[PDB]
């Protein structure tokens, strides 16, 4: 994995030795080359993971997250170069450096063979993200957004450090390859109960769990667009990746300890989706939709059946692409009306027809339209939770009603109806913006032709 870490590192001289006008072009070009190179991680086998070294490996779980991670960086650089056009050159290079450093931490968060190196990169992803949100955010509440984002995360993860060092001292190694073969059954005790909670609550925070989700609608709406894209697309999926690694060790206690965290998810995806029926802010609606979609991934990991893991990893990749596109579309309106209010600018299919087609496709992939990988992940989670308990289909099916009822409402409020009369700075769609929407949607649609590369280690 050292053929991906060193090009990402070499993007630091590439953004700091460039001309004052070429720093977006060079970083976009070479990060697109790194994203093209990311497809060599598809050397996956039906029995063995792709094990590079003592430090780095990549199974079929980490590989789609890595391809999505290395693909998201040129897209964040395309989204972020408009609102940072008046920016100082040094601060512009600092923003590009924080995105590069965040990519560098993510691509060896997902490949960390050993779990405390996973912890160090997993908690190292805070600091560039914190700096991006609290420095290049727009409003007053970006500082409170950074405080909530930092102190839910570290409150969840500082027990995780102690739990991982306990596993290091007890088992002898936090190598995930050794812990596949030295895993012992975790019995029923209070020590093992708080062992389970210390292993899980960090990822429950970063997914987010319902009830712990309160950092997210502050951290998504107060971030800039590259921050919103990286929290939606990747930084929620650190929790899912970490759960799918750490629930190996947490058996058979999970089979009676996951009950409060499934209910909180199965009712919470009803609540947050319901919140999306009444959100006046468009970016907050996309944030609460992200909570609603990651609650299904929480249920699918906690029931730990194979169909559930396959649906959860397909749902993570699909939701990453879809929610990143939704934040980019909301940014496309915010760069024209300079307010995130969803009822402000209406009727925008008369004014931006092709951008309304991109809104339509992103709204259809939000509501899980088949055969998209959104519906593949949604459907497989619903199948495995029907296997879990037959009554859950109620809480599933009702959610699939409400997920439609805000996916099209967002389509009808922003793009349909009579347009706002007193708004006249509605420019035609830039080629940068349509390129950004197409680079989100066209991989999301091509992955319907071959979904087997985004279905985890147990396809």
């Amino acid at each position: 994995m050292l053929k991906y870490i060193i090009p990402t590192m070499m993007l630091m001289p590439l953004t700091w030795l460039s001309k004052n006008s070429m720093i977006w072009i060079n970083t976009t070009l070479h990060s697109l080359l790194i994203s093209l190179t990311s497809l060599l991680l598809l050397n996956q086998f039906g029995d063995n993971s792709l094990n590079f070294s003592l430090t780095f490996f990549s199974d079929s779980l980490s590989t789609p997250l890595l391809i999505l991670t290395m693909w998201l960086l040129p897209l964040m650089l395309m989204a972020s170069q408009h609102h940072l056009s008046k920016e100082n050159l040094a601060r512009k290079k600092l923003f590009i450096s924080m995105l590069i450093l965040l990519q560098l931490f993510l691509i060896m968060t997902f490949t960390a063979t050993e779990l405390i190196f996973f912890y160090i990169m997993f908690e190292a992803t805070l600091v560039p993200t914190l700096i991006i949100i609290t420095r290049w955010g727009n409003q007053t509440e970006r500082l409170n957004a950074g405080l909530y984002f930092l102190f839910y995360t570290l409150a969840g993860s500082l027990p995780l450090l102690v739990a991982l060092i306990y596993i290091q001292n007890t088992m002898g190694s936090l190598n995930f390859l050794i812990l596949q073969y030295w895993v012992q059954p975790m019995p029923n005790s209070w020590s093992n109960t708080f062992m389970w909670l210390a292993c899980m609550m960090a990822f429950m925070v970063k997914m987010p769990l319902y009830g712990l989700h309160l950092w997210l609608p502050k951290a998504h709406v107060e971030a800039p667009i590259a921050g919103s894209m990286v929290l939606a697309a990747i930084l929620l999926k650190l929790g899912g990746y970490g759960m799918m690694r750490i629930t190996l060790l947490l058996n058979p206690i999970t089979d009676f300890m996951a009950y409060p965290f499934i209910m909180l998810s199965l009712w919470g995806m009803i609540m947050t989706s319901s919140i999306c029926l009444r959100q006046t802010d468009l970016k907050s609606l996309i944030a609460y939709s992200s909570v609603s979609h990651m609650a299904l991934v929480i249920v699918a990991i906690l029931i730990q059946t194979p169909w559930s893991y396959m649906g959860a990893t397909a749902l993570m990749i699909a939701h990453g692409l879809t929610s990143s596109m939704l934040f980019c579309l909301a940014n496309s309106n915010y760069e024209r009306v300079h307010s995130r209010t969803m009822i402000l600018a209406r009727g925008l299919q008369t004014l931006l027809p092709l951008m309304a087609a991109w809104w339509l496709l992103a709204s259809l992939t939000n509501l899980a339209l088949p055969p998209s990988i959104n519906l593949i992940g949604e459907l497989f989670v619903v199948m495995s939770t029907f296997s879990w308990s037959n009554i859950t289909i109620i809480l599933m099916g009702l959610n699939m009603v409400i997920t439609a009822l805000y996916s099209l409402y967002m389509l009808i409020t922003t793009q349909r109806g009579k347009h706002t009369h007193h708004i006249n700075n509605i420019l035609p769609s830039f080629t940068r913006e349509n390129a950004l929407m197409s680079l989100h949607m066209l991989p999301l649609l091509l992955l319907s032709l071959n979904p087997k590369i985004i279905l985890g280690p147990l396809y």
Binding site: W136, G137, N138, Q139, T140, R142, H338
Partner: protein
């Protein structure tokens, strides 16, 4: 439409002798700038 940066109302929250003024910590004026007091 531009980026919010703090004003005088935000920045004067950090100018007191303490950060969270209570009833006891209310008469505390901030210390002098060169830390040199009048000889009284």
């Amino acid at each position: 439409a531009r980026q919010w940066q703090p004003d005088v109302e935000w920045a004067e929250q950090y100018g007191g002798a303490v950060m969270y003024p209570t009833k006891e910590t209310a008469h505390w004026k901030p210390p002098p700038w060169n830390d040199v007091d009048p000889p009284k």
